[PDB]
Amino acid sequence: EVKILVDRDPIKTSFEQWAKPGHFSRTIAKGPDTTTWIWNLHADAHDFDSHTSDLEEISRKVFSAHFGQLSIIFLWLSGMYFHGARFSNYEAWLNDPTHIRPSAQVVWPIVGQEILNGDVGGGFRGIQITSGFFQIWRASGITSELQLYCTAIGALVFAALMLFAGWFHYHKAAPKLVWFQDVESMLNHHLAGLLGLGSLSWAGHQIHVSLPINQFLNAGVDPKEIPLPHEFILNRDLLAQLYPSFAEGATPFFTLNWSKYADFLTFRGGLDPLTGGLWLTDIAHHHLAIAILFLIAGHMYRTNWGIGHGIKDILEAHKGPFTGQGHKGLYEILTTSWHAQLSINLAMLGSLTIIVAHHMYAMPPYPYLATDYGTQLSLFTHHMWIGGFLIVGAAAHAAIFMVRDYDPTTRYNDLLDRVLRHRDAIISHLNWVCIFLGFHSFGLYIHNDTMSALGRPQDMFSDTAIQLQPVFAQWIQNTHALAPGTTAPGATTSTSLTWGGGDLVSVGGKVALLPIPLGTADFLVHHIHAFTIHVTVLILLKGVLFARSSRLIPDKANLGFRFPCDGPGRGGTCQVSAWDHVFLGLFWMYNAISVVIFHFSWKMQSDVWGSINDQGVVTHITGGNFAQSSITINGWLRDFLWAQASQVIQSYGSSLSAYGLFFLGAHFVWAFSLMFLFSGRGYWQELIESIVWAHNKLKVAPATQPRALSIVQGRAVGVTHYLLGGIATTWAFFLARIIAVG
Amino acid sequence: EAWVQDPLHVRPIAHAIWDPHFGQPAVEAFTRGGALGPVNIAYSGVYQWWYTIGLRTNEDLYTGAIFLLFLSF
Amino acid sequence: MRDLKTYLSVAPVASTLWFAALAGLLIEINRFFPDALTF
Amino acid sequence: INLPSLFVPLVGLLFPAVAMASLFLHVEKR
Amino acid sequence: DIAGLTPCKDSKQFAKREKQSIKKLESSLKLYAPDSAPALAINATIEKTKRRFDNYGKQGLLCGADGLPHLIVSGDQRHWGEFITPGILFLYIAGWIGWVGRSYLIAIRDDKKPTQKEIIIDVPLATRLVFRGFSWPIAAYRELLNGELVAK
Amino acid sequence: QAALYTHHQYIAGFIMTGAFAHGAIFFIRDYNPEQNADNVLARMLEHKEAIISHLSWASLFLGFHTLGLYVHND
Amino acid sequence: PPELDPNTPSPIFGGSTGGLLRKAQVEEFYVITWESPKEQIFEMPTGGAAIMREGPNLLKLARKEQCLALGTRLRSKYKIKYQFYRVFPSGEVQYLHPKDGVYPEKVNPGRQGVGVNFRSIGKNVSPIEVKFTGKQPYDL
Amino acid sequence: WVTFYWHWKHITLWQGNVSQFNESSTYLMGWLRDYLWLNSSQLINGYNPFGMNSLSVWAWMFLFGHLVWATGFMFLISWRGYWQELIETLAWAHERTPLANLIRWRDKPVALSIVQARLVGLVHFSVGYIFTYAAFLIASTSGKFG
Ligand code: CLA
Ligand code: CLA
Ligand code: CLA
Ligand code: CLA
Ligand code: CLA
Ligand code: CLA
Ligand SMILES: CC1=C(/C=C/C(C)=C/C=C/C(C)=C/C=C/C=C(C)/C=C/C=C(C)/C=C/C2=C(C)CCCC2(C)C)C(C)(C)CCC1
Ligand SMILES: CC1=C(/C=C/C(C)=C/C=C/C(C)=C/C=C/C=C(C)/C=C/C=C(C)/C=C/C2=C(C)CCCC2(C)C)C(C)(C)CCC1
Ligand SMILES: CC1=C(C/C=C(\C)CCC[C@H](C)CCC[C@H](C)CCCC(C)C)C(=O)c2ccccc2C1=O
Ligand code: SF4
């Protein structure tokens, strides 16, 4: 009986607990004896498990916290639209997108910082943005700062509404546990509701606002003279003159003459050659079809009627000779453990973001996006990092599930048990394949560096020597290029100009996309990716499989998820906790993503991006140097890092100088992280003793007794500054380089 | 012996190199000084030191080495 | 209200207000008397 | 060349192999 | 002059630097209409640049071969504005902060749960101690002379 | 000249760290508190907090200001 | 008088990669026994879930610490009593726990002090006073 | 710091323009760009896709030094317990792999000691530190003779 079940006035709204730091925790609430209190207060703030063991009361906390996050995002979007409206050159940028640099931030004149207001065109001075908002607003048919002002007010309203709902669904009407557990209703309402009615209603905007307004923009008529969006709704003839399918109205839709709509609903593929982005008629037809699939998919699971499955039935029906009982018991686990849910969602949301990175570069979905080399290098890198972080988060809450929620007596599952029963076979196999990968990927580079140093370039793994051609990738490329005439007859051109074949698309003399060649160097850097990803999974998967126990620590699960070690005995047990595996996996995730984005930057500058001639002579940014240079480590040192770092280290005295300072600053924070990772709190606590003595000598010691950070905090502080400094360095290196040469 | 006759125009040689991994371009590039084969140039300053204190001939150096070998023993 | 005044006195809140006030003061001294290297 | 072609493989292949084999037997003995 | 330097008001490389700097800003200035907001802004930077260079020249700053002011902190009386004077001001303020800070830990040290006023500021108490800092040299010297400043 | 200066300053650095490392080892293996009672060596142990916290102060002063000055210039 | 060791049945377990290795054949291994009032699932110290049988229960384990970890879990969760032993490759058995029939947490007469120094820790001599003797300060 | 300083003061002396040091040394971007980056160009070209020269050894040792140093970071950042559990799964795997079953170790494989790893990491760190800087020092100075 799926119904709305809510409790009335569970938690009284009062500032009483704002005045009581650590009220959520019974230990923390008593107040500080030492400075360690300060940190545990923050480390435990969102660990709703440790606050209360009641699953209903935990779910209410995560529900209202989600509203809190949505409030923050809307407020974030409000400012993005507000700055486009009030502090931007978007209106000027619409008239000349090939030349004017998007800018939506202006610094006040103080202490000489005006120099960051750069000559970006359009009679404007500001910081060049790489979020890509301008390409979005154009593709949405936004034509004035007035339209951004109204979107910013709506975002601000939604921010208040989301905040109100969070307070409302925690203090006034808090859903009962069984309401959250109705996973069938939720899946139906998200497939059909969120995904379905979102893609359908957005398709409506693309049809009635985005398609027509972009046709005027691409025809060349001034945005101040393009008819306002509501005129294409009030007066159909405006639409019909651009797409005569609207003349017959909604009649061809219901009469199954859908082919009549073939002028604004297409299957062309490739890129609009006068704008550089995907065809807005292909995109609108995409959201249309996608909306249909989700509206029907939101009818799969059973609710208040008869049709539909119980998700438990589908799970309990899949099991084999090698697996036994199979997926039985998973429905109780995924309806009682928030961390099991969070592990899967982080895994997939992370993976999906990495895909968004690839698809958005090879099939640029926004007009004049592909030729804004700075925006596109930022978008791909930004989503790689977001994706890689979310993935490492999946391993933590998978590990947290094993320590806290796993219970074979109440919620058994033979699939999970079967893996636990041979975790030594899994981890040892992943260990060996990692050793194989490392030797047969990175070792080839070392071969090349040593061969090239000895004056023996004939013995290298090179396109001009021992060639390692990626035959299988080359084959897939040549296949997709022949799909539009053959295996995809309805498709006019390939889904991407990257597909080894076709021609080229340019916007404003700048190359947008051409076929991307894959040779020996692409073979090497792809086996680095497989190596680095494998080691990341090795560390993280090992952390979850031995989170409860190991031959070394039989009762590890009793030590919790997050604990420093179990002491110097057994030869030493530092970093046995699953939490420490997540700590080590972040460094490897960082490693893997760093060379992925380096791979991306060098390839694009070398073999894709560049300027096209009057006659078609393409001059790439680094002139095809990727093939002979990227097969030795010295090639990455010299031809990539040393050469492309030019821009950032000579940015002083120009509007790019803030990247100069961030380049050095992030180096600093990165080196600073090593103090924490290389040392240990015993040293620091003794040091503090001598310092405390000095304070006592002058009657200035605090009653909150100073303590060294805990062992785990030291590690957390270390990896946090390591990742921040590391990534920020590449950030300042990428933006300076691409804004100066893109 | 060539260094002591022209100390500002001769890169001092540390020792010969004999590495069967070398390709021919590495054999040429490392053939420097007045030597007949690949060599390393000395950055230890022993030529200036030994010359300043009186050493002049390869023989001077040989009997010095033998004497230090005796002291080692 | 007294609970709110207690929270407004908690270390982080009192710090941002203190340092915000400080930053405003130093910024305005630098807008009125910029580029001071001597004194 | 008539002597380096003798001593370089001797000190870089033979001696380390003879040394590594010698030390392997002393450290493993009981 | 001191340390082989020359007054920035007589220095040719100092003057060159101002000239190259204004020329840099004028290259940007010429992009924009003269009434426009960027033109006013770049012009504001230009005037501030001119005020700065004349100010350093009139304050007596010595310049090196680089055309940049170099500070004389040795004690020489023509250069007290470069260290002694802002330094006395720093020590006066720094001692004020520390003396006030110690006043608060002492004021709360005999309280019931002293760490409670360390994580939740007793702002009323603090407004009463904040001006003890004005006279820290006299107060700190006085606590010294009568055994109150250091513990034994 | 570059190799010679660099070679000896690194040799000197390692040698200086060994000098303190064997001071530490002296204090553990060999130091007899009773036969050094109240002498200049024992008195160093008596006021170790004074010694250590002033090195700490001197290092903090030099780090804040040296780094602060370079960062200002940058 | 220490308990005995027959050939009682073992819990129901499908096998795992966590069990005994060559050390058991050549050095030693351990066996824990216990009596349960009913069949029930429990977690194996080597990974996975097994079902203990009602009544007698024998389990071979590779390490002493694995035994005590399982046994500590038997008292807390299952409230059952347990013992374990060290088995050598010659078949020689050695009773281990609870040593004198009494768990070591509770005082029991007949136990003799081992390793007790009758002084506070801070009264250990300096290392120089035991140099070239074979003793550490904590040995006196 | 002291050797960077000695070298950069002398290389700009030897080159006949102390002013490069007098001006670029008062800020840290100057050291990074006008000392490290400027003086690396001959060294990193000791071998390139176009051939090699006598600076090839130092280019290779330069990277070798970066590699040893970075390997030190492993022993310094990851600590023992992680590696002891991993080695155990390799003990298992070795005793369950046919043919390889026949061969047996005489010394039980164990992760390095806590202290041992601090040392091994320190040694890697120090070794790569010294080899990186010596390669740079020698190549940059000898590639032009100051
Ligand atoms: C993610 C959101 C975001 C971000 C990062 C920024 C960032 C910026 N905005 Mg912007 N803005 C946003 C959203 C955002 N905005 C939205 C949604 C609006 C519409 C309401 C605006 C409207 C707006 C205007 C009108 C202006 C800016 C300006 C600026 C710049 C300077 C701001 C400054 O120094 O304030 C000054 C700093 C403060 C006011 C901080 C005071 C410190 C107090 C003590 C903190 C209080 C803490 C307290 C405990 C919590 C209070 C919560 C309360 C709101 C309930 C800066 C780049 C300025 C600019 O670009 O000038 C050229 C400018 O004039 N923004
Ligand atoms: C003024 C309105 C109001 C009042 C008086 C209360 C009062 C209370 N709430 Mg409630 N709540 C409200 C609004 C309010 N709530 C809203 C709008 C929501 C939706 C998010 C919730 C959601 C909510 C949950 C989910 C929970 C409470 C809890 C509580 C109790 C203690 C909370 C506490 O210590 O807060 C003090 C906390 C803060 C001041 C934290 C600030 C909160 C915002 C969201 C942080 C955002 C900062 C942002 C990240 C920027 C920082 C980053 C950058 C600076 C680096 C207390 C009875 C808790 C409780 O009773 O459990 C025992 C509990 O679990 N409430
Ligand atoms: C939707 C995503 C999501 C959600 C809801 C959670 C939720 C949770 N995680 Mg999880 N996690 C995630 C993603 C997520 N995580 C990802 C992506 C990773 C990989 C990095 C992890 C890694 C992880 C670990 C390793 C641990 C958790 C823990 C927790 C729990 C406690 C969190 C807490 O109190 O922190 C309070 C939050 C803070 C103290 C914030 C600290 C400040 C951060 C680290 C720095 C941010 C820097 C910023 C981006 C740059 C600004 C710099 C500027 C200020 C100068 C909570 C259930 C902890 C636990 O025990 O769970 C039970 C735990 O130990 N998570
Ligand atoms: C550049 C520095 C560096 C290097 C080389 C390694 C190397 C390795 N790490 Mg590691 N690590 C590092 C830094 C580094 N790490 C840091 C900073 C951290 C802290 C976050 C870690 C944390 C970490 C963890 C947590 C894990 C690893 C793992 C691995 C192994 C991956 C498998 C592999 O490729 O083996 C092949 C080895 C190489 C590719 C190294 C180069 C080999 C050379 C080129 C061949 C030499 C041939 C021959 C021997 C010549 C020498 C002759 C001589 C004796 C005379 C490998 C041994 C994983 C592991 O053990 O998986 C098996 C693992 O789980 N590391
Ligand atoms: C009442 C505040 C106060 C006072 C009077 C002192 C005084 C001293 N400290 Mg201490 N210290 C403080 C706070 C304070 N400290 C805090 C908060 C920290 C944590 C960051 C430290 C950490 C620290 C270290 C690590 C060292 C000293 C040292 C010293 C001595 C030499 C001066 C120095 O290095 O300053 C250094 C000052 C700092 C590093 C930071 C303190 C600055 C904060 C901003 C001032 C306190 C603000 C406080 C919130 C005021 C609230 C009052 C209000 C409620 C009315 C001297 C006894 C050194 C020493 O022992 O030499 C013998 C030394 O090695 N201190
Ligand atoms: C670049 C990296 C780096 C940096 C900056 C430091 C910094 C420091 N180390 Mg450390 N260390 C490092 C690497 C580094 N270390 C490594 C690799 C190791 C090997 C494990 C060690 C091992 C080590 C030991 C064993 C000791 C030190 C000590 C010190 C202190 C030296 C005194 C000093 O400079 O005071 C000045 C302080 C600083 C320069 C720190 C940075 C100050 C920042 C920039 C001010 C921030 C202001 C700004 C408002 C912050 C905004 C941030 C925002 C998010 C809120 C200082 C805190 C000694 C110490 O504690 O002496 C008292 C000490 O005993 N370190
Ligand atoms: C951007 C933005 C924004 C905005 C948004 C908007 C503007 C939205 C709108 C939206 C919309 C405005 C939507 C709509 C919707 C609609 C729908 C979803 C519909 C549906 C329908 C249906 C389902 C149908 C049915 C049917 C059928 C099937 C058959 C026949 C009959 C009928 C027709 C009945 C905001 C401010 C928030 C924030 C920031 C950003
Ligand atoms: C300028 C001049 C001069 C003067 C000089 C002088 C007077 C100097 C001094 C110097 C010095 C005066 C130095 C010092 C140094 C120091 C050191 C470097 C130390 C160290 C130490 C240590 C390392 C220790 C250790 C230990 C321990 C810890 C424990 C016990 C034992 C021992 C002791 C071993 C003259 C007149 C000639 C003239 C010319 C000019
Ligand atoms: C350097 C560091 C130390 C010491 C660093 C700690 C003590 C951090 C100190 C943090 C702040 C600066 C303490 C003071 C915080 C107060 C809020 C400051 C109030 C003053 C006002 C300006 C706000 C250890 O704790 C240690 C932990 C274990 C692994 C190695 C590490 C690590 O290497
Ligand atoms: S070193 Fe730190 S972490 Fe490693 S064992 Fe000893 S205490 Fe535990």
PDB file of N, CA and C in Angstrom, chain C residues 13-34:
ATOM      1  N   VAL C  13      32.146  32.014  13.718  1.00  0.00           N
ATOM      2  CA  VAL C  13      31.325  33.170  13.377  1.00  0.00           C
ATOM      3  C   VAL C  13      31.999  34.453  13.840  1.00  0.00           C
ATOM      4  N   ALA C  14      32.509  34.451  15.065  1.00  0.00           N
ATOM      5  CA  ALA C  14      33.171  35.649  15.550  1.00  0.00           C
ATOM      6  C   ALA C  14      34.423  35.940  14.738  1.00  0.00           C
ATOM      7  N   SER C  15      35.055  34.901  14.183  1.00  0.00           N
ATOM      8  CA  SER C  15      36.245  35.116  13.369  1.00  0.00           C
ATOM      9  C   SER C  15      35.924  35.762  12.030  1.00  0.00           C
ATOM     10  N   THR C  16      34.899  35.293  11.307  1.00  0.00           N
ATOM     11  CA  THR C  16      34.648  35.926  10.017  1.00  0.00           C
ATOM     12  C   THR C  16      34.263  37.378  10.214  1.00  0.00           C
ATOM     13  N   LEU C  17      33.375  37.655  11.175  1.00  0.00           N
ATOM     14  CA  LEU C  17      32.986  39.040  11.427  1.00  0.00           C
ATOM     15  C   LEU C  17      34.198  39.895  11.789  1.00  0.00           C
ATOM     16  N   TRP C  18      35.093  39.363  12.623  1.00  0.00           N
ATOM     17  CA  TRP C  18      36.285  40.104  13.024  1.00  0.00           C
ATOM     18  C   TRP C  18      37.203  40.360  11.840  1.00  0.00           C
ATOM     19  N   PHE C  19      37.444  39.324  11.044  1.00  0.00           N
ATOM     20  CA  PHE C  19      38.360  39.431   9.922  1.00  0.00           C
ATOM     21  C   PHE C  19      37.728  40.148   8.741  1.00  0.00           C
ATOM     22  N   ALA C  20      36.412  39.994   8.550  1.00  0.00           N
ATOM     23  CA  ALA C  20      35.706  40.815   7.573  1.00  0.00           C
ATOM     24  C   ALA C  20      35.876  42.290   7.901  1.00  0.00           C
ATOM     25  N   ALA C  21      35.553  42.678   9.138  1.00  0.00           N
ATOM     26  CA  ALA C  21      35.763  44.061   9.555  1.00  0.00           C
ATOM     27  C   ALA C  21      37.202  44.487   9.330  1.00  0.00           C
ATOM     28  N   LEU C  22      38.154  43.602   9.650  1.00  0.00           N
ATOM     29  CA  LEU C  22      39.565  43.916   9.455  1.00  0.00           C
ATOM     30  C   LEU C  22      39.878  44.133   7.980  1.00  0.00           C
ATOM     31  N   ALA C  23      39.399  43.231   7.124  1.00  0.00           N
ATOM     32  CA  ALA C  23      39.689  43.334   5.707  1.00  0.00           C
ATOM     33  C   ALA C  23      39.115  44.627   5.133  1.00  0.00           C
ATOM     34  N   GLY C  24      37.863  44.958   5.486  1.00  0.00           N
ATOM     35  CA  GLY C  24      37.284  46.224   5.050  1.00  0.00           C
ATOM     36  C   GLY C  24      38.124  47.412   5.483  1.00  0.00           C
ATOM     37  N   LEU C  25      38.553  47.415   6.740  1.00  0.00           N
ATOM     38  CA  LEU C  25      39.399  48.505   7.197  1.00  0.00           C
ATOM     39  C   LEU C  25      40.692  48.575   6.375  1.00  0.00           C
ATOM     40  N   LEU C  26      41.384  47.445   6.197  1.00  0.00           N
ATOM     41  CA  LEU C  26      42.652  47.528   5.471  1.00  0.00           C
ATOM     42  C   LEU C  26      42.452  47.885   4.000  1.00  0.00           C
ATOM     43  N   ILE C  27      41.343  47.454   3.406  1.00  0.00           N
ATOM     44  CA  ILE C  27      41.085  47.770   2.017  1.00  0.00           C
ATOM     45  C   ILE C  27      40.858  49.266   1.846  1.00  0.00           C
ATOM     46  N   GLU C  28      40.105  49.872   2.760  1.00  0.00           N
ATOM     47  CA  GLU C  28      39.783  51.286   2.641  1.00  0.00           C
ATOM     48  C   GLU C  28      40.980  52.164   2.946  1.00  0.00           C
ATOM     49  N   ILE C  29      41.847  51.736   3.860  1.00  0.00           N
ATOM     50  CA  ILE C  29      43.094  52.464   4.060  1.00  0.00           C
ATOM     51  C   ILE C  29      43.917  52.408   2.796  1.00  0.00           C
ATOM     52  N   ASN C  30      43.814  51.309   2.053  1.00  0.00           N
ATOM     53  CA  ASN C  30      44.590  51.174   0.830  1.00  0.00           C
ATOM     54  C   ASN C  30      43.928  51.876  -0.354  1.00  0.00           C
ATOM     55  N   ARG C  31      42.617  52.087  -0.301  1.00  0.00           N
ATOM     56  CA  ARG C  31      41.956  52.918  -1.292  1.00  0.00           C
ATOM     57  C   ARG C  31      42.207  54.401  -1.038  1.00  0.00           C
ATOM     58  N   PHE C  32      42.327  54.803   0.226  1.00  0.00           N
ATOM     59  CA  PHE C  32      42.559  56.205   0.537  1.00  0.00           C
ATOM     60  C   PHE C  32      44.026  56.569   0.463  1.00  0.00           C
ATOM     61  N   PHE C  33      44.911  55.667   0.858  1.00  0.00           N
ATOM     62  CA  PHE C  33      46.341  55.949   0.888  1.00  0.00           C
ATOM     63  C   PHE C  33      47.089  54.818   0.195  1.00  0.00           C
ATOM     64  N   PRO C  34      46.889  54.653  -1.107  1.00  0.00           N
ATOM     65  CA  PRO C  34      47.465  53.494  -1.811  1.00  0.00           C
ATOM     66  C   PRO C  34      48.983  53.565  -1.922  1.00  0.00           C
TER      67      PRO C  34
END
